[PDB]
Structure formats: C-alpha cells, structure tokens
C-alpha cells in the first residue's frame, strides 16, 4: 500500500466515469471535466515517482508539448477538428513507442512476456503515429488525397508487416541496437504504407481505428512496465475505441475493411 497507487486508483475511477458520462448527451459536457481531473491527478501524483532524475527536462517537455498543443486547439477553426484529433492521436501513438524504445535500449527485461508486450505496444503506436500523420496531411490538404493505389500494394504491405513482426520477435533472444532501429523504421513504414490506399471521406473511421490502436498501444506498455494508469486507461480506450470504430463504419453504410 502506497500513495501513487492510491492516486492511480482514483485516476481510474475518474477516467471510467468520465467516459461513461461522455457516453450520454444529458451527461456529456460533464464527461471531459471528470476526465480532466483524472489527467491532472495522474500527472501530479507521478512527480513523486521515487528516484526520478531529469526533473528540469521533464518540465520543459511537459510545457512545450501541452501549450503548443493546447494553443493549436483553440486557434484552429471548427471544421478542422477531425485532423486535430488525428494529430493528437498520432502523438499518443509516438508517445507509446518512445516508452518501448527506451525500455528496450536499456536492455534489462528479465521477463520475456513483459518484453513481448513492450514490443507489441511499440509496433502499434508507431503504426498509429505515421498512420495518423498521413491521416492529418490527407484531410489537411498538404498531402491532399484520394486513394493512392498501385497494382500490387496489398502484398508489399502484408510483406512489410510480416518483416516488422519478424525483426520484432527477434528482439526476445538477441536485442541488438541494429535490430531496434530496423523494427521501428519498418513499423513507421507500415503506418504510412497501410494508410495510403484510404480515401478522403473514409478518414473518420480510420482515425477511430488508429485511436483504438493507440489505446491498446498505451495498455500494452502499461502491463509491460507495471503501470496501472496505463494498463486501465489504455485497455479501456482500446476496447471502447474498437466498438466505436465499428459503429461509425456501420453508420456510413460501410464496413471497416471496406475502409482499409
């Protein structure tokens, strides 16, 4: 029994109710406020993490990220919400990957299952990372898009995915830096690759998909490192994100797979 545990315990409940309240119109505006408290409490509680160096740089990072992000949110017009969501989601993904990357580079994983979850988180985040950045650029005009097809893409994609998974699993015996660089480059490549064939109107669904993905990404890292705030909220959002992705596809007459 300790206080960061207590802190995260409340944090969970706070995320669960928030989401649930966001679930119904009559309670919705109520929702994020509830979540906001979770967010705050989780951030502030973790400053106490024992033996935590680099306090200066933590703060610079928090500040650069939050305020440009926050600023971008208010300055931007109301029809650019979708790419706004994409991009923040993107970051969420990357955030996931960095956890995975640093924890592997240190090498010290004394459990192969834990290590697998690290890697799995790693894979999914990066895919969402670049996936969501291509999402943004597409709706945003800077990549301007309708489905970027070419005759045998289905195979090269699945092949790249295959390779990624191979180099990935390789880390579990032999975790050499060369491999670690390769893994991420290949994942990052797949997020890009797998997004390309996706048309303009479909994007919402894709975003929900990659949202569900980042959710799982965060959860995996959580189980892996041993962090209850990640575990719960990650898996809460992966699940909800999954069902929600379905419902949006099924609302456009389309079917997810039709979308990808």
């Amino acid at each position: 029994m300790d206080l960061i545990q207590a802190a995260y315990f409340v944090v969970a409940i706070l995320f669960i109710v928030g989401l649930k309240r966001m679930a119904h119109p009559t309670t919705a505006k109520s929702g994020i406020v509830w979540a906001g408290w979770g967010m705050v409490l989780a951030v502030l509680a973790t400053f106490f993490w024992p033996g935590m160096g680099n306090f200066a740089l933590i703060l610079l990072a928090l500040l650069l990220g939050s305020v440009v992000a926050w600023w971008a949110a208010v300055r931007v017009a109301m029809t650019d919400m979708p790419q706004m969501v994409a991009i923040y989601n993107g970051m969420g993904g990357g955030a996931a990957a960095t956890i995975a990357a640093v924890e592997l580079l240190k090498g010290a994983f004394e459990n192969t299952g834990l290590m697998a979850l690290a890697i799995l988180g790693g894979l999914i985040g990066s895919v969402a990372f670049t996936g969501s950045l291509i999402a943004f650029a597409k709706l945003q005009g800077i990549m301007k898009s309708r489905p970027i097809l070419f005759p045998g893409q289905k195979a090269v994609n699945a092949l790249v995915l295959a390779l990624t998974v191979v180099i990935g699993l390789s880390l579990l015996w032999n975790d050499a830096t060369a491999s670690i660089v390769l893994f991420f480059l290949l994942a990052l490549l797949f997020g890009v690759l797998m997004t390309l064939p996706i048309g303009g109107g479909d994007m919402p669904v894709a975003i929900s998909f990659y949202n569900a993905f980042t959710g799982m990404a965060v959860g995996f890292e959580g189980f892996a490192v041993g962090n209850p705030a990640l575990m719960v909220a990650g898996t809460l959002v992966g699940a909800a994100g999954t069902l929600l992705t379905v419902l949006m596809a099924r609302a456009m007459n389309r079917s997810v797979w039709s979308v990808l």
Partner: protein, 89 residues
C-alpha cells in the same frame, strides 16, 4: 509495482468488457466527440513517458525520453481542448 500474471489478466479483460459496454448504445451525434474524449484519455501515456525519462541514464535515452514526453503532453492537452469545444452541443 507488482501485479501477478493472473491479477493483470483479469484486470485486462474486465476493463476490456467495461470499455466495450459503455459505448454499446450511443447516439450518432455523440460518436466523434466521444472519439475525441477517448483520444484524450489515452494521453495518459505522458505519465508512462515521464517515468521513463526520469530513469534514463545515457544521452541517447534522455533524447528519446524528452521527445515522447512532448508527444504524451500534446496528446492529453490537445485531447482536452478539442473535446471541450466539441462538447458545445
């Protein structure tokens, strides 16, 4: 933090059911704000990144720790702002 394999497996599955169920009956009008709100909640990665950075020994480690804390923070902060705006309905 010690969680046993089984304790974690139960935690994983239970929250997965919960997550799914909360979204069952949700009006069309609420999809995307809800998609935005969940997007926000994963921003809790930032906490995961912070703990990584604070434990980073080598210069390489420090550098990709810094980077992800930005990504984390943008996710929560940008998450929060957009969802509040979207919740003007």
């Amino acid at each position: 933090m010690e969680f046993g394999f089984w304790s974690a497996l139960y935690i994983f599955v239970l929250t997965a059911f919960l997550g799914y169920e909360l979204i069952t009956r949700v009006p069309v009008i609420l999809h995307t704000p809800l998609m935005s709100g969940s997007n926000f909640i994963h921003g809790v990665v930032v906490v995961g990144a912070m703990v990584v950075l604070g434990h980073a020994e080598t210069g390489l480690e420090k550098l990709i720790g810094f980077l992800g804390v930005i990504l984390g923070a943008a996710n929560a902060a940008g998450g929060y702002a957009v969802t509040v705006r979207m919740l003007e309905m």
